[PDB]
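Aim 2 progress. For MLU1-BOX binding protein, the working sequence is reproduced below.
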Amino acid sequence: NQIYSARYSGVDVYEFIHSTGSIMKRKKDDWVNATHILKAANFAKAKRTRILEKEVLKETHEKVQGGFGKYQGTWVPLNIAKQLAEKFSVYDQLKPLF
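Predicted structure tokens for this construct:
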């Protein structure tokens, strides 16, 4: 259940190596990349954008666009990431990172 310490574009993170890709938690504030959670539920790109674009973008978040490929995406507070994960029942796999 490999969790490493990493840094991308000035941001320090914890990176959980999941089967579907790396999932990231930011060390400064415990926000979690909601695009990674959605990739962990096996959602394809257009579906990820719709779920982003309905749900997530109406609550607190930051839309990271522009740099390292695996850092990019929509980031949200820890409690909203846990909700999403539980909503698409990926909560138990990402527990180690949470």
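Strands lie at 3-8, 11-18, 21-26, 32-33, 62-64, 73-76. This observation will guide construct design in the next reporting period.
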